[PDB]
């Protein structure tokens, strides 16, 4: 998005200038969906997925860079050794074994507040594993 730093503009020239049309450069294509000024599109030679055509004709879906990160939702205070999940009754339950307690805990996802809800527990001395298997 270096282009938008300047406010007023009427002409930008692209001729004989090499490029590598990747996801990071994808913004240009997105900017090419908003551009109005007099511009001539030239060839781009980056990834081989992009052939000898014009960048303005590109679509943002040709670059398939899906940014994936992780958002923290720390709520469970209890310690754990084995965490294993299994689909059952159209609700994939998460089963957790708590050390030093002998407690096996069951969590079910609910859409009330976008979390997992504890609903059941097991008796034990010091849990190590709680391998869940559903058969019949």
């Amino acid at each position: 998005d270096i282009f938008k730093g300047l406010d007023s503009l009427t002409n930008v020239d692209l001729r004989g200038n090499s490029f590598n049309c990747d996801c990071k450069l994808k913004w240009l294509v997105e900017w090419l969906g908003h551009t109005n000024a007099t511009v001539e599109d030239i060839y781009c030679e980056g990834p081989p997925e992009y052939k000898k055509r014009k960048i303005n004709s590109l679509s943002s879906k040709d670059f398939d860079c899906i940014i994936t990160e992780f958002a923290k939702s720390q709520d469970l205070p209890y310690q754990s050794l084995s965490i294993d999940t299994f689909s059952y009754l159209n609700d994939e339950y998460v089963v957790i074994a708590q050390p030093f307690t002998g407690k096996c805990i069951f969590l079910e996802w609910d859409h009330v507040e976008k979390t997992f809800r504890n609903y059941d527990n097991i008796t034990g001395t010091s849990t190590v594993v709680c391998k869940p298997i559903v058969i019949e």
Binding site: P99, T125, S126
Partner: protein
């Protein structure tokens, strides 16, 4: 007391070539590895047992194994112990084998129960494993050698259990996740063993270690005139005695019971009261900070007028045999069962262990045959039952016996060798024999048929310890002193 005193177990490690090759043939790596394992085991033992395991020496075979190596822990343990008897001579409380041959058994390491401070029993075998793994194995084996074992009867009855219920305790099968705490019955067995007189060679401080001179390591080693330890713990004990491994102006001690308030205590003080009649009280020499060397009644001395004999400082009676084998509530039966079962019978009275044709016992003496006790419980404290416990019923007595085994070929079901049958009449090879069978030595005596000129008792080192105001070596001259 003696229990509260800091025990010093002189351990020497024998290492085979399997783990030497597994350690890239490096001598120094194996040496430092053994040092680290010894330090880790000492850290284990310091929390409760108050016992420091001093690595006096260690031998690792860079060439190859001398004797036959088998996956059987018992056979390999026997081979290691006989090799120690044949070749190893240096003084060491425990001789432990790091077995490169990983035993194909379920138990981690094989160590005799209560076998420490013995030439043919003082140690065990620990198989190959991880640093922490064989450290735990060594701790378990040394607990075995000092008589500390998991109590099967209390395990079944729930009398005492592991307080580290998370991952169990060390005495059980070695789980991956090590615990940090021993049970109270471990310590109770330790007091019972030390009070019985066993483990009397653990009360000496070695002057030479495998560790270079290190200030504050708890041992007065070469190059250190005094050592009170790190000044953090030096405040409680020996604050004014030794500082920074150096004396504080006029001083004569660093630690030790024979030196109170950093100054010499009066002559004649008892730095160690006798645990029983088999033990001899120790008096400070008058110029030595550390207590007198442990001295016990010489092997053959009776715990009482006739019954019982002190072997290695440990009392042995028929009642004591029943207590060790079966339990405290179990006591030896009367002569009625001995003369009514050992004379003739299968599985009830037998001199020698022969399943096909049981060995007959004569009427002259029946006290070395089948060990017969009173009110034997469902399971013994240690060992295994060869079949079922024998039960046999004017006076009526609840008569019982068994065939308790051990990790050794010796059978605890019978009467142990040396149990008295009468005047100088004690068990040898499941038979009552005189002293001439054992060939006990005669201490320094001047009269005829006496010990230490009559008045006085000979210690375990075959040296007379004369009574009060008797300075002569053979208890012959009286020297009054104040």
């Amino acid at each position: 007391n003696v229990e509260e005193e800091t025990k010093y177990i002189e351990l020497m490690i024998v290492n085979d070539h399997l783990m030497f090759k597994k350690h890239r043939l490096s001598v120094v790596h194996t040496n430092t590895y053994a040092k680290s394992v010894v330090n880790m085991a000492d850290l284990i033992y310091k929390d409760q047992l108050k016992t420091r395991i001093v690595l006096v020496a260690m031998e690792t075979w860079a060439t190859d194994n001398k004797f036959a190596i088998s996956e059987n822990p018992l056979i390999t343990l026997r081979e290691f112990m006989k090799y120690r008897r044949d070749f190893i001579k240096e003084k060491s409380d425990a001789v432990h084998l790091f077995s490169g041959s990983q035993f194909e058994s379920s138990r981690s390491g094989a160590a005799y129960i209560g076998g420490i401070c013995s030439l043919l029993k003082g140690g065990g075998v620990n198989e190959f494993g991880k640093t922490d793994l064989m450290a735990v194995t060594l701790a378990q084996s040394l607990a075995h050698n000092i008589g500390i074992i998991s109590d099967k009867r209390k395990l079944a009855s729930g009398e005492c259990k592991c307080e580290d219920t998370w991952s169990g305790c060390i005495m059980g099968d070695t789980g991956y996740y090590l615990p940090k705490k021993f049970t109270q019955c471990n310590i109770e067995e330790y007091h019972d063993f030390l009070n019985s007189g066993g483990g009397a060679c653990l009360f000496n401080k070695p002057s030479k270690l495998l560790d270079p001179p290190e200030c504050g390591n708890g041992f007065i080693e070469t190059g250190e005139e005094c050592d009170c330890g790190t000044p953090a713990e030096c405040v409680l004990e020996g604050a004014e005695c030794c500082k920074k491994c150096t004396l504080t102006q006029d001083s004569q001690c660093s630690d030790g019971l024979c030196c109170k308030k950093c100054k010499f205590q009066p002559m004649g003080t008892v730095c160690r009261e006798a645990v029983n009649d088999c033990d001899i009280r120790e008096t400070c020499s008058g110029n030595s900070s550390q207590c007198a060397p442990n001295i016990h009644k010489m092997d053959g001395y009776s715990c009482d007028g006739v019954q019982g004999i002190c072997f290695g400082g440990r009392c042995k009676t028929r009642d004591r045999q029943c207590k060790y084998i079966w339990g405290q509530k179990v006591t030896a039966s009367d002569k009625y069962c001995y003369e009514k079962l050992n004379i003739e019978g299968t599985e009830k009275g037998n001199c020698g262990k022969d399943k096909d044709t049981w060995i007959q016992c004569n009427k002259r003496d029946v006290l070395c045959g089948y060990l017969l006790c009173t009110n034997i419980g469902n399971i013994p404290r240690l060992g295994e039952l060869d079949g079922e416990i024998t039960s046999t019923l004017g006076r009526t007595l609840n008569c019982s016996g068994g065939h308790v085994k051990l990790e050794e070929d010796v059978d605890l079901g019978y009467v142990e060798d040396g149990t008295p049958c009468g005047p100088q009449m004690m068990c040898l090879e499941h038979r009552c024999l005189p002293v001439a069978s054992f060939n006990f030595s005669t201490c320094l005596s001047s009269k005829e048929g006496t010990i230490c000129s009559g008045n006085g008792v000979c210690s375990n080192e075959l040296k007379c310890v004369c009574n009060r105001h008797w300075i002569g070596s053979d208890c012959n001259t009286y020297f009054p002193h104040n």
